[PDB]
C-alpha cells in the first residue's frame, strides 16, 4: 500500500464496482447483458446462449437506450430518443421488433414523445401514454384504441403522474395497472387545474438569446392539491367503431369528505383490485377491495371489506402505507404495519375481517415482503444481531410462524451483512445481492432447499486492484443517549492511529425514516477524503431516523428541524470525546434534507463546527411540496402547525452564521427543492452581514448530476474542506 484513493479516482471512476443485473423472463430463465450482447441464462445449469446479438441493430440509425421484451417472448420493445424529465419521468421514441420474423414493425407505430409504455403481464398487448392520454394495442402492428380523450398538458394526466405524485407518492411516472392476465387496464387520472405553478429560468445553450421560463404545477405546503380519479377499462372488449367504456371506482365515503390521495394500487386476482387512500392529514388511510361484477360490467367495493390503517403518534407508513401481498386466491393478504410497540412487522389479514394477526414480532423491523408462495413468505429484515443497519433474507413457514429460517445470515457473515433479493417468476430461484461490508457479492440459489448454485459476481477484478491502494476502513457502532442506542458509522483513514487527532467531517442526511449508518460498502467522496486527506467521515442516525420503531421515527412528528438537528450536534460532541478527533477541525455537510440540517446546525450557535456545506438545501417548509411536507408538519395555518413552520427556518438563524464558515450550493433548474430556497438563505445572510461562499450551477437540477457539474461541485467542495482543515 502507498497509492491513496484520490479525488480523480472517485470522479473519473478508476475503481469500478461490478454488478450482476438480471431480469427474470420466466421461472427458469433470465436475461443478461454480456459484452454488449443480450444473453439468456438457464438458472438450473448456468448455460447461456445469445438472445439478441449486439450488432443486430448497427443499421437501426438510432442509438438504443433500453430494451423491453414482451412476457410471452414474441416481441421486443426498443426505446430510443430518451429525454429525461423529473426523477422517474422521461419521453422516448419506440420501435417494436418481431422476434419470430426477425423484422422491425413499420405500421401503426408508437408515436414519438411517448410518455410511458408497458406490456400486459402476459401475452404481448401494449398500453402507452402520449399527450397525456392512454392508448392500447392488442397486436403490435394493428391500430391503437384511444382509451381517454381528456389528457391536457400540465392539467389532465391519464395513466401518468403529475410532479407531486411522481415524486412523493408512486415514485414512478406510470399510473397504469394491468390485471394479472392482462384483461383489465386500471388507471388513475390527475387534475392539476388549480395547482399553482413553480416558475424558474432555464438558460439552455448559449445560442438561446432569451432565457426560457419553465412552469410546473407544484403544490407547496398548504396549497391546492391535484385531485385524483380512478378507472378500469376492459381491453378484451375494445371496439374499433365505438369509444372505450372506463368504469370509475370512487374513493370511500371516509376519504371523499376532504382532500385525499390515492396511495397504492395492487391487483389481488383477475377480478379483484385493492386501492389504498390516504387523507391529506396523513394519519388515516383506507384500503378498499373491489370485485368485478360480470352481470353489471362494474366494480363494487364492499364497506364491510375496507381496512383502516392509522397512527396516533405520527403519519402512516414509513413514507406511505405499505403494499399488500395477497395469497393466490385473493381472500387474505400480508402487509407490514407497526405493532403495539411501534415496530413494523408482517400482519396477516382476512379480506372480511378487521383484525389481523402478527406473524413476526420483536425489537427490530421488517423492511419488505419479497415473495409469497403457498408454503412460505419471504421477507427482508434488520433482525440479525440487533443491527438496524444490516439486511437479511428470511423465510417464514406459513403453516407455523415459529419456523423462520435466515437464508443469508450465515453465507459469508464476515463480508456480507446487507442483502437484497430477486426471485424468479414463481420464486423457484433467487439471486442474492450483498452490498457489504465487503465488496458486493452476487449469488444464485434454488428455493427448494436454499442451496447455492453458483457465484455470479465476486468483484475479484476490483479486489486485486484495491490491494495496492491505501484504503479507508469503516467502523459501525452505537452510542447511548437517554438509555437508547443510536447508531453511527465512521469512514476511517488508512493506518488509523487512536493516538492521533484527525479532522472530522459529519456527513448528514437525517430526514424522517433515514438511515445513514449501515453495513454497505461504498466508493464515494468520503472514500477520497479519508484515504487521501486523512479526514474521518462520520454519520449518525438520531431521532427521526428509521428501521428502529416509531418511538424513534415519530420523535420529530410535527417538529422538523428540532430533535434530528440537536442529535447531530450531540453526536459530534460524543465523537470529540472519543479522543482521536481534533476539536478545532469539525465540519458538517449534507445534500437537500442534509443541506437543511447542516444549515440548521451551523446556525445553532453551538460552537462545535468550524465550517459546513449545504447543497440544494430546504430552507423553510412552506417552500417544499405538500405531500412530503404535510406528512411530517401538518398545515402551515394558525389553527394547526404554523408556529413551528415559522420557527424552523434557516433564515431565522442567520445571525449565528457569523461563528462559522459556510458554503451554499444550488442548481438553478432544481424542480424539487427550488432555487428559491437558497436564494432566501443567501439574502438573509446578506441582511445580517455574514460572509459566506456560494455556487449556483446553471441549468442543473436537484441531482447536480451532469458529468461536468458533478466533477465541478466535488472539486469545489474539496478545496473548501481542505482550506477549512488547513490541508495543502
Amino acid at each position: 500500500s502507498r497509492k491513496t484513493y484520490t479525488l480523480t479516482d472517485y470522479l473519473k471512476n478508476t475503481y469500478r464496482l461490478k454488478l450482476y443485473s438480471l431480469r427474470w423472463i420466466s421461472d427458469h430463465e433470465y436475461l443478461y447483458k454480456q459484452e454488449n450482447n443480450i444473453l439468456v441464462f438457464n438458472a438450473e445449469y448456468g448455460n447461456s446462449s445469445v438472445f439478441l446479438e449486439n450488432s443486430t441493430f448497427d443499421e437501426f440509425g438510432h442509438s438504443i437506450n433500453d430494451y423491453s421484451i414482451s412476457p410471452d417472448g414474441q416481441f421486443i420493445l426498443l426505446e430510443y430518443n430518451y429525454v429525461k424529465q423529473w426523477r422517474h419521468s422521461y419521453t422516448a421514441s419506440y420501435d417494436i421488433y418481431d422476434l419470430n420474423k426477425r423484422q422491425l414493425i413499420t405500421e401503426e407505430r408508437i408515436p414519438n414523445n411517448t410518455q410511458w409504455v408497458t406490456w400486459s403481464p402476459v401475452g404481448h398487448k401494449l398500453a402507452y401514454v402520449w399527450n397525456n392520454d392512454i392508448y392500447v394495442k392488442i397486436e403490435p402492428n394493428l391500430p391503437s384504441y384511444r382509451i381517454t380523450w381528456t389528457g391536457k398538458e400540465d392539467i389532465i394526466y391519464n395513466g401518468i403522474t403529475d410532479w407531486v405524485y411522481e415524486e412523493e407518492v408512486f415514485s414512478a411516472y406510470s399510473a397504469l395497472w394491468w390485471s394479472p392476465n392482462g384483461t383489465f387496464l386500471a388507471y388513475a387520472q390527475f387534475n392539476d387545474t388549480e395547482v399553482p405553478l413553480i416558475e424558474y429560468s432555464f438558460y439552455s445553450d448559449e445560442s438561446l438569446q432569451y432565457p426560457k421560463t419553465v412552469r410546473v404545477p407544484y403544490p407547496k405546503a398548504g396549497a391546492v392539491n391535484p385531485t385524483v380519479k380512478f378507472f378500469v377499462v376492459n381491453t378484451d372488449s375494445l371496439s374499433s367503431v365505438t369509444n372505450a367504456t372506463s368504469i370509475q371506482i370512487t374513493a370511500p365515503a371516509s376519504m371523499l369528505i376532504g382532500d385525499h390521495y390515492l396511495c397504492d394500487v395492487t391487483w389481488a386476482t383477475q377480478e379483484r383490485i385493492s386501492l389504498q387512500w390516504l387523507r391529506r392529514i396523513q394519519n388515516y388511510s383506507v384500503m378498499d377491495i373491489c370485485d368485478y361484477d360480470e352481470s353489471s360490467g362494474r366494480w363494487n367495493c364492499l364497506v364491510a371489506r375496507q381496512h383502516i390503517e392509522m397512527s396516533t403518534t405520527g403519519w402512516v407508513g414509513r413514507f406511505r402505507p405499505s403494499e399488500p401481498h395477497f395469497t393466490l386466491d385473493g381472500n387474505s393478504f400480508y402487509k407490514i404495519i407497526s405493532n403495539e410497540e411501534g415496530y413494523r412487522h408482517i400482519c396477516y389479514f382476512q379480506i372480511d375481517k378487521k383484525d389481523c394477526t402478527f406473524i413476526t414480532k420483536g425489537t427490530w423491523e421488517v423492511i419488505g415482503i419479497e415473495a409469497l408462495t403457498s408454503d412460505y413468505l419471504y421477507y427482508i429484515s434488520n433482525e440479525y444481531k440487533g443491527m438496524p443497519g444490516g439486511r437479511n433474507l428470511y423465510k417464514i413457514q406459513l403453516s407455523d410462524y415459529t419456523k423462520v429460517t435466515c437464508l443469508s445470515c450465515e453465507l459469508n457473515p464476515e463480508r456480507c451483512q446487507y442483502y437484497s433479493v430477486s426471485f424468479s417468476k414463481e420464486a423457484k430461484y433467487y439471486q442474492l445481492r450483498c452490498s457489504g461490508p465487503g465488496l458486493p457479492l452476487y449469488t444464485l440459489h434454488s428455493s427448494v432447499n436454499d442451496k447455492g448454485l453458483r457465484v455470479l459476481e465476486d468483484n475479484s477484478a476490483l479486489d486485486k486492484m484495491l490491494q495496492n491502494v491505501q484504503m479507508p476502513s469503516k467502523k459501525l457502532d452505537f452510542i447511548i443517549l437517554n438509555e437508547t442506542k443510536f447508531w453511527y458509522q465512521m469512514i476511517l483513514p488508512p493506518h488509523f492511529d487512536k493516538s492521533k487527532k484527525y479532522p472530522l467531517l459529519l456527513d448528514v442526511y437525517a430526514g424522517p425514516c433515514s438511515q445513514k449508518a449501515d453495513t454497505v460498502f461504498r466508493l464515494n467522496w468520503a472514500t477520497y477524503l479519508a484515504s487521501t486527506e486523512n479526514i474521518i467521515v462520520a454519520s449518525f442516525d438520531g431521532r427521526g431516523s428509521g428501521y428502529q420503531g416509531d418511538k424513534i421515527m415519530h420523535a420529530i412528528n410535527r417538529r422538523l428541524g428540532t430533535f434530528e438537528v440537536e442529535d447531530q450536534i450531540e453526536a459530534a460532541r460524543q465523537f470529540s470525546k472519543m479522543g482521536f478527533v481534533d476539536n478545532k477541525r469539525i465540519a458538517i455537510w449534507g445534500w437537500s434534507y442534509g443541506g437543511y440540517v447542516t444549515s440548521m446546525v451551523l446556525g445553532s450557535g453551538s460552537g462545535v463546527f468550524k465550517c459546513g456545506i449545504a447543497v440544494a438545501p430546504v430552507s423553510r417548509w412552506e417552500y417544499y411540496d405538500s405531500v412530503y411536507t404535510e406528512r411530517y408538519m401538518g398545515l402551515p395555518t394558525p389553527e394547526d402547525n404554523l408556529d413551528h413552520y415559522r420557527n424552523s427556518t434557516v433564515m431565522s438563524r442567520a445571525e449565528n452564521f457569523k461563528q462559522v464558515e459556510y458554503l451554499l450550493i444550488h442548481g438553478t433548474a432544481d424542480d424539487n427543492v427550488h432555487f428559491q430556497q437558497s436564494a432566501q438563505i443567501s439574502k438573509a445572510l446578506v441582511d445580517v452581514g455574514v460572509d459566506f461562499q456560494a455556487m449556483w450551477y446553471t441549468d442543473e437540477d436537484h441531482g447536480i448530476a451532469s458529468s461536468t457539474a458533478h466533477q465541478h461541485i466535488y472539486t469545489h467542495m474539496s478545496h473548501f474542506i481542505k482550506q477549512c482543515f488547513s490541508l495543502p
Binding site: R87, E167, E168, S171, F319, Y509, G511, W591, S592, Y593, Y596, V615, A616, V618, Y624, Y628, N672, V673, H702, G703, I704
Partner: peptide, 4 residues
Amino acid sequence: YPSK
C-alpha cells in the same frame, strides 16, 4: 423527497 428532499434527497439527491
